[PDB]
Amino acid sequence: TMKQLTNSMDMMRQACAPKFKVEEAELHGLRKSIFPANPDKELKCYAMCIAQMAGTMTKKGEISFSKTMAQIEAMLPPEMKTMAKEALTHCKDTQTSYKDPCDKAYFSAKCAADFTPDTFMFP
Ligand X SMILES: c1ccc2[nH]ccc2c1
Q: What is the contact surface with ligand X in residues (CB under 6 A)?
A: 47, 50-51, 54, 56, 63, 68, 105, 108-109
Nearest-angstrom CA–CA distance, 51 and 54: 5
42 labelled binding-site residue: no
Angle formed at CA 76 by CA 73 and CA 79, multiple of 5 degrees: 100
CB 16 within 8 A of CB 53: yes
CB of 9 to ligand X, least distance (A): 10
13 belongs to an annotated ligand binding site: yes
Least distance CB 92 / ligand X (angstroms): 10
Residue closer to ligand X by CB (options 27, 63) is 63
Distance CA 9, CA 107 (A): 19
CB of 105 to ligand X, least distance (A): 4
Q: Is 73 annotated as a binding residue?
A: no
Q: What is the rounded (10 degree) CA torsion for 91, 97, 103, 104? A: 50
Q: Known binding site for Fe(2+): residues?
A: 13, 24, 28
